[PDB]
């Protein structure tokens, strides 16, 4: 339980997210991050070492969201410039640039089938663009304030969304309809993800409690006291035994999803961490943030 790799000065500007693979489709060995200095670096974690493989540019505004497609070795990047540009980790070239104008462009959401991409809209709806199309296919009519987080399930059976006022909106990606609306928070939901089995749903609000609700019956499974600052990023281990939590307090606690206990905490980041993500197997835990330093956390 420690840190393996320590990437000093991983960017010119603060990193706001981090993406890493979990499959064997040339995704787990390459590290795609998006920082505010408009450098989409394609880091190749080869030879147990964080090497730069590609350096993609073109975004007017800093990168807001980076994620690796599940069934595909390609990638994409969103920002606040309403221009969501698709990329390829096979050539380091640009596929396309979805002009999600005028401003309505937020974090991305790769479908597990790698066929749809969800992106928040300022109107409160969740626009589902098509990966190879770029056009607005279908949009969820659940208005409100704004979508602050969107996530796809690993098997693709449900879909949630974090609003500005702590409103989980459990959608159905199989029919496109709002099923539940979980309002166990009044804090702006920062991020969330789905369990590897699509049974638990963590919510990273701005109250520092890890309220892990359920999706099958839309109910709370237990209030976990998280950090004292705001949990920014939260990911589950691929083998489904633990889950990490990024707050805004230079604190990398690794909570247990079964016992709700911190099994390890990192304090190597001088600043607040912004992105956390697991490896393909869950030993290496990559982490980014305003320290612009990519730490690789091993917990064998």
């Amino acid at each position: 339980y420690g840190i393996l790799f320590k990437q000093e000065q991983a960017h010119d500007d603060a990193i706001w997210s981090v993406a890493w693979g979990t499959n064997k489709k040339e995704n787990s060995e390459t590290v795609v991050t998006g920082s505010l200095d408009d450098l989409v670096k394609v880091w190749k974690w080869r030879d147990e070492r964080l090497d730069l493989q590609w350096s993609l540019e073109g975004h007017q505004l800093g990168v807001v969201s980076v994620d690796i497609s599940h069934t595909l070795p390609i990638a994409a990047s969103s920002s606040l410039d309403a221009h969501i540009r698709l990329w390829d980790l096979e050539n380091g070239k640009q596929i396309k640039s979805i002009d999600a104008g005028p401003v309505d462009a937020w974090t991305l959401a790769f479908s597990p089938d790698s066929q749809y991409l969800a992106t928040g809209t300022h109107v409160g709806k969740v626009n589902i663009f098509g990966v190879e199309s770029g056009k607005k296919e279908y949009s969820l009519d659940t208005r409100g304030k704004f979508i602050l987080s969107i996530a796809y399930s690993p098997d693709g059976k449900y879909l949630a969304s974090g609003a500005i006022d702590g409103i989980i909106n459990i959608f159905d990606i199989a029919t496109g309809k709002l099923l539940h609306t979980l309002e166990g928070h009044a804090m702006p939901i920062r991020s969330l993800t789905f369990s590897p089995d699509s049974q638990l749903l963590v919510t990273a609000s701005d109250d520092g409690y890890i309220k892990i609700y359920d999706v099958q019956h839309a109910n709370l499974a237990g209030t976990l006291s998280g950090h004292a600052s705001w949990v920014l990023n939260v990911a589950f281990c691929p083998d489904d035994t633990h889950f990490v939590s990024s707050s805004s307090d230079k604190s990398v606690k690794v909570w247990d999803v079964g016992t709700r206990t911190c099994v390890h905490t990192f304090f190597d980041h001088q600043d607040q961490v912004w992105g956390v993500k697991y490896n393909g197997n869950g030993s290496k835990i990559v982490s980014v943030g305003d320290d612009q330093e990519i730490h690789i956390y091993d917990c064998p």
Partner: protein
């Protein structure tokens, strides 16, 4: 207390079988330096073992852990509180000294610590274990509502806080907590005066807490354009009278001068507000208010060099990273190269946390126009930047159309975007005029490199 200290300095040197001498030492030093009571408790803990094998009573361990609770030795104070609990439980025949109240205070400090140790579940359970056995306690019932008030100001906090007041209406803490509920929504601006004037009876007098909460709710009514209506001047004079009264009765209260500096700045004396805020800064400058009130004069006198650090220093606290209100104050009269492109980076850091604000989306456009007019008017500058300036100008123009459809604004309608659209129009014309200068400089550099390559071929 001076005589007790000077008497204790006499028992400290000599050793006439001192046993309780170190207790009376630390019993005075708890208000004074918190290390002195700790140094006295360390030795009083070991001086109670030489006469007999007697365990330390829980009463000493509870206070030594209480001192460490305020310190960074939270785990060590937690072991002190666990051991104070285990020792006070052993007092089955100490019914006169009431081991039960000692376990109550130790568990109270222990849940007070657990709330602070990133553990509200254990704090809730420990505070409920006091509620289940003694519902006539107030702090355990008040500290429970605070924990739920983090999740929202409409949960069991606003209910527990009013339930505590009906059982004890003469509790200035529980009643002062009531007005703090109405502070989430300032819609109770004028109407809060009533609920703040409840315990303004002479039996509670004097109470600086409430009188200053009045001056605060009166200052919040400033920053309005109706000052020529002889309305805000009266408000200034009223809050100034409040402050002069809490000044005459308390010269060492800092909050009294805090509002006086605010009004003198609102009167137009920034040259004379630094002097009033100097006494406040010097006493304690580690209050979030002074870092800002002082920073407005500095950004007022064209010293962003002394204003930008004052804003970063407030953000050094572990409560957020990217606040809106600071960064609003950060960009005021910035025109400099480190003050425009970098100001965009902080603006994006602010909109990253909540883009729903209109003023962030407006200022990101105003700075974008400032930068584009600073490369497409008198420049005659680099070539790649002429390519990049049009992209920024296009994004600013797309935002110009998106802002105009929004209903609510910054308490000021944004109908004045027309001058901005006209500026961006003539900016488009000047950019199309200068993109040709870009190609002229291209041919210039190509012929310079060729006329240099030929000189090298001569050698």
């Amino acid at each position: 207390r001076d005589i007790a200290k000077g008497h204790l300095k006499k028992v400290t040197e000599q050793y006439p079988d001192d046993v309780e001498a170190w207790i009376e030492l630390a019993q005075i030093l708890e208000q004074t330096d918190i290390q002195g009571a700790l140094s006295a408790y360390g030795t009083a803990t070991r001086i109670l073992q030489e006469k007999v094998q007697a365990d330390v009573p829980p009463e000493i361990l509870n206070n030594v852990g209480a001192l460490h609770f305020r310190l960074g030795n939270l785990g060590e104070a937690k072991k002190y509180f666990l051991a104070s609990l285990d020792r006070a439980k052993a007092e089955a025949e100490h019914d006169e000294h009431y081991y039960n109240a000692i376990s109550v205070t130790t568990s109270y400090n222990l849940a007070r610590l657990y709330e602070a140790m990133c553990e509200f579940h254990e704090a809730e359970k420990l505070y409920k274990n006091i509620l289940r056995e003694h519902p006539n306690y107030v702090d355990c019932y008040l500290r429970l509502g605070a924990m739920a008030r983090d999740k929202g100001n409409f949960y069991e906090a606003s209910d527990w806080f009013k339930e505590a007041l009906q059982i004890n209406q003469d509790h200035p803490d529980a009643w002062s907590l009531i007005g703090n509920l109405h502070l989430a929504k300032q819609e109770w601006g004028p109407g809060q005066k009533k609920f703040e004037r409840i315990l303004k009876q002479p039996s509670t007098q004097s109470d600086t807490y409430s009188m200053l909460a009045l001056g605060n709710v009166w200052l919040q009514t400033l920053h309005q354009p109706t000052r020529d209506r002889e309305k805000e001047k009266r408000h200034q004079d009223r809050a100034l009278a409040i402050y002069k009264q809490v000044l005459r009765n308390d010269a060492k209260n800092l909050y009294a001068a805090n509002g006086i500096g605010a009004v003198l700045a609102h009167k137009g004396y920034f040259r004379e507000a630094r002097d009033v805020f100097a006494q406040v800064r010097e006493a304690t400058a580690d209050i979030s208010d002074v870092w800002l009130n002082l920073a407005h004069i500095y950004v007022e006198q064209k010293q962003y060099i002394s204003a930008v650090q004052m804003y970063e220093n407030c953000l050094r606290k572990f409560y957020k990273h990217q606040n809106t209100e600071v960064v609003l104050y950060l960009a005021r009269a910035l025109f400099k190269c480190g003050k425009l492109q970098e100001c965009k980076q902080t603006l994006l850091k602010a909109r990253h946390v909540a883009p729903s604000d209109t003023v962030l989306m407006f200022n990101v456009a105003l700075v974008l126009q400032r930068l584009a007019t600073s490369v497409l008017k008198d420049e005659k500058s680099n070539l790649k930047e002429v390519l990049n300036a049009v992209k920024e100008l296009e994004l600013a123009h797309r935002y110009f159309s998106y802002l105009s459809k929004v209903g609510d604004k910054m308490r000021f309608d944004l109908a004045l975007a027309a001058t901005e659209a006209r500026q961006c129009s003539d900016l488009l014309s000047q950019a199309q005029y200068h993109v040709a200068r870009a190609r002229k400089q291209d041919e210039e550099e190509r012929e310079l490199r060729a006329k240099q390559e030929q000189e090298k071929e001569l050698l």
